Each structure stands twice: as structure tokens, then as C-alpha cells.
Write an enzyme that holds these catalytic residues in place. Structure first.
Site, short mmCIF file in Angstrom:
data_model
loop_
_atom_site.label_atom_id
_atom_site.label_comp_id
_atom_site.label_asym_id
_atom_site.label_seq_id
_atom_site.Cartn_x
_atom_site.Cartn_y
_atom_site.Cartn_z
N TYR A 83 0.84 -1.20 0.00
CA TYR A 83 0.00 0.00 0.00
C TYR A 83 0.88 1.25 0.00
CZ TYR A 83 -3.88 3.18 1.29
OH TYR A 83 -4.80 4.21 1.39
N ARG A 88 -0.90 8.05 -4.22
CA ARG A 88 -1.83 7.09 -3.65
C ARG A 88 -3.20 7.74 -3.43
NH1 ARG A 88 0.27 4.66 1.81
NH2 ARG A 88 -1.32 6.06 2.68
N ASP A 89 -4.23 6.90 -3.56
CA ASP A 89 -5.59 7.32 -3.20
C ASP A 89 -6.05 8.52 -4.03
OD1 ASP A 89 -5.64 5.41 -0.85
OD2 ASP A 89 -4.07 6.83 -0.20
N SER A 95 -4.56 12.17 1.10
CA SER A 95 -3.77 10.93 1.15
C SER A 95 -2.55 11.12 2.06
CB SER A 95 -3.32 10.44 -0.21
OG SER A 95 -2.49 9.21 -0.11
N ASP A 135 -7.48 0.59 -2.94
CA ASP A 135 -7.78 1.95 -3.39
C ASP A 135 -6.89 2.39 -4.55
OD1 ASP A 135 -9.33 4.34 -3.31
OD2 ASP A 135 -7.89 5.38 -2.03
N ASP A 313 -9.51 5.43 10.18
CA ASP A 313 -9.50 5.66 8.74
C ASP A 313 -9.06 7.05 8.31
OD1 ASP A 313 -10.72 3.08 8.06
OD2 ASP A 313 -12.63 3.88 8.79
#
Length: 358
Positions: A83, A88-89, A95, A135, A313
Site C-alpha cells: 500500500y 496514492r488514493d 492521502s 484503493d 481511517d
């Protein structure tokens, strides 16, 4: 299929999650509930390699697992999440990823993979199962109108390809993230999803180690719902079993006998969201079905706990540069700390609301 990565192996329990849980259980004041909270440390979870800084700990887990197997006469299995994509994301508002496309992201990512491979290679008696990049690829199905995703598309594909190709060299069993029923399980998204994942499987040589897909990672959907959650209106695939049974045959028609794993770590309580898009610290979640290969579906190798419940989260503090307004919705538990950090009140409800009970 024939080869379920988990059969014949004992799963190495995360020492980190165990330490988080033990600290958490000491603060739970009802003694019985504290006892049940402490027992969560015996439930296997995935270790998230969300930064290069996590790699040293991976090496220790592999070595510890090797020794534990020799002591007990077992073969041990370590569960990881890859990850760390650059940018990312891409469709989120915020992110935490350390790498950026613009700063040598994919060379940095390939170094991250190489460091992980170099650790795994040292412990050939330990099996590794990896979830590849939550994701990520799901965004390339539905979110190419998001400019950060459009601009990241070639990097996401190249980096996932690099991960698949190089982790296969050390025999890692891999499940690429595939969102969840409310992302890619919409009937109209099934074919573009299958086309993408098949492309990716063919680009990485159809390795037998590329077992299939992981679903519901860090989400809350039922595997098999007694009745559809109202958030699912319009989508006949209202739970993960419907999604998987609709997607898997499409993969099979290409000759990929894809199998699946499904996160249920925060799925014990259904009908807790206002809208299906609400993903952050959903209030009232309970721990769900514990990990098992007794999945009750042909396509599903294991129910798993990928996201470690209790780890946040995302923050509800709008002054953070990592703020996401999803985390302030009526169905998001607040106030909430930064992503990945421990959210004690949320953990205690996960324990209290576990289903099946702990």
C-alpha cells in the site's frame, strides 16, 4: 481451486495489532468486555506496508514466524498489504502516501518493492499472502474523470505490474484489491473491471501466484446479507457474495481461475451507513465473521481481516492537512484522530458490537 494458500498453514498473528489490542483492552473498564477485547489479539489480521518505514518490521515478522513454525512443527503464513503507490488514493480528498509521481515516484516504489522482496527471499520456509494496493486499480474503472487518477493511471498500472512480477519471484500469493460490491459490483462496472484485471494478470505472464482479487478491504459490506442494506438501492449486487459470483465467471472466461478473499473485520453490523460512499470510521461498526477458509462460496478462498479494526481511517479535524470531509458525516464516529492511529472508543464499540459475539 485446488490450491488455497491458507490450507496447511498457521497464520502468524500480528505483534503490532496484538500490542495495540492489549493496550486497548487495559483501558476498557468493564472486565468482561475487556476480556473479549484482549482476545482480539488472537484473531489474524493483515500487516499494512503503508510506507518504507514498515519494512524493517516485516523482516522481523518473517523471522519470528520461521522460528514459531520450527518450534511447533507448523508451517507459518504472514499476511501483508502492499500500500504505497505514488500519488496514492487519487480519488480521495486527502492521502498519507509518501511518494509522488512528480518526485521519482515509480523509481521510489520499485525500490520499496525491492526491499520487501529482499526480506521475503531470506525466509523461504514462511509463506506470504499479499493484498496488492487497496484503493488503486478500482479508480481506473470508475474514476478516470478525477484528474489526479487520470494522471496517475500509467503509474498505478506500472507499479502494480512491478509488484506482481517481482513478488511472484519469491513465491508470494497475491490478491489484487478490487474494491467492493458498491464500487465495482454494479453490474455495469463488472465488464470494465474484468477487462482491467485480466489485462493486468496477462501483463504480469499469468503467474500462478496471482490468485485473484481481494474485496471489501477496509469497508463494511456484508458477505451474505439477510436483506439488502438500503444504501444499495439500484445495485442487485448488494453484498460481496453477489459481487464475486457476478465478477468471477468473467475472469474465468479468460482462463484466469480467479479466487477471492473478503475482508469482514468491520462487517458485523449492517445498515449503519447513510450512503454507500460513506467510508470513514463508520459509527456502530462491529467486528465481523472471523477469518476462515470455510467461506461457503466456490470463489472465495478465505474470509479475512485486512483492515485492523481500531486503527483510524482518517481524522475529523478540518485543520489537518489530511482532512477528509467523509470523516465528519453523521455516520462517522467523531472526533477521530489521524489515519492509522489508534481510535480507542471506536475499538471498544467494535468489540461490544461484534457479530458473531466474541
Amino acid at each position: 481451486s485446488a490450491n488455497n494458500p491458507w490450507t496447511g498453514f498457521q497464520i502468524f498473528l500480528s505483534p503490532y495489532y496484538a500490542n495495540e489490542v492489549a493496550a486497548a483492552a487495559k483501558q476498557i473498564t468493564d472486565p468482561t468486555l475487556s476480556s473479549k477485547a484482549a482476545s482480539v489479539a488472537n484473531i489474524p489480521t493483515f500487516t499494512w506496508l503503508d510506507s518504507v518505514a514498515k519494512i524493517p518490521d516485516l523482516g522481523t515478522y518473517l523471522a519470528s514466524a520461521s522460528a514459531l513454525g520450527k518450534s511447533t512443527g507448523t508451517k507459518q503464513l504472514v499476511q501483508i498489504v502492499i500500500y504505497d503507490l505514488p500519488d496514492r488514493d487519487c480519488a480521495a480528498k486527502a492521502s498519507n502516501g509518501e511518494f509522488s509521481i512528480a518526485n521519482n515516484g515509480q523509481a521510489n516504489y520499485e525500490n520499496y518493492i525491492d526491499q520487501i522482496v529482499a526480506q521475503i527471499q531470506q525466509f523461504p520456509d514462511v509463506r506470504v499472502v499479499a493484498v496488492i494496493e487497496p484503493d488503486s486499480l478500482a479508480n481506473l474503472v470508475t474514476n478516470l474523470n478525477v484528474q489526479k487518477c487520470a494522471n496517475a493511471k500509467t503509474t498505478y498500472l506500472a507499479c502494480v505490474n512491478y509488484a506482481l512480477t517481482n513478488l511472484a519471484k519469491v513465491g508470494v500469493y497475491m490478491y489484487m484489491d478490487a474494491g467492493h460490491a458498491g464500487w465495482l459490483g454494479w453490474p455495469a462496472n463488472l465488464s470494465p473491471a474484468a477487462q482491467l484485471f485480466t489485462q493486468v494478470w496477462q501483463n504480469a505472464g499469468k503467474s500462478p501466484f496471482i490468485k485473484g482479487l481481494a474485496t471489501n478491504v477496509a469497508n463494511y459490506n456484508a458477505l451474505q446479507a439477510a436483506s439488502p442494506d438500503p444504501i444499495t438501492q439500484g445495485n442487485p449486487n448488494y453484498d460481496e457474495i453477489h459481487y464475486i459470483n457476478a465478477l468471477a465467471p468473467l475472469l474465468q472466461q479468460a482462463g484466469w481461475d480467479a479466487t477471492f478473499i473478503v475482508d469482514q473485520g468491520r462487517s458485523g453490523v449492517q445498515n449503519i451507513r447513510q450512503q454507500w460512499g460513506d467510508w470513514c470510521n463508520i459509527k456502530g461498526a462491529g467486528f465481523g465473521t472471523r477469518p476462515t477458509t470455510n467461506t461457503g462460496s466456490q470463489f472465495i478462498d478465505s474470509i479475512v481481516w485486512v483492515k485492523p479494526g481500531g486503527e483510524c481511517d482518517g481524522t475529523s479535524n478540518s485543520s489537518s492537512p489530511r482532512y477528509d470531509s467523509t470523516c465528519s458525516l453523521p455516520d462517522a464516529a467523531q472526533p477521530a484522530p489521524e489515519a492509522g492511529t489508534w481510535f480507542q472508543a471506536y475499538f471498544q464499540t467494535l468489540v461490544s458490537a461484534a457479530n458473531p459475539p466474541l
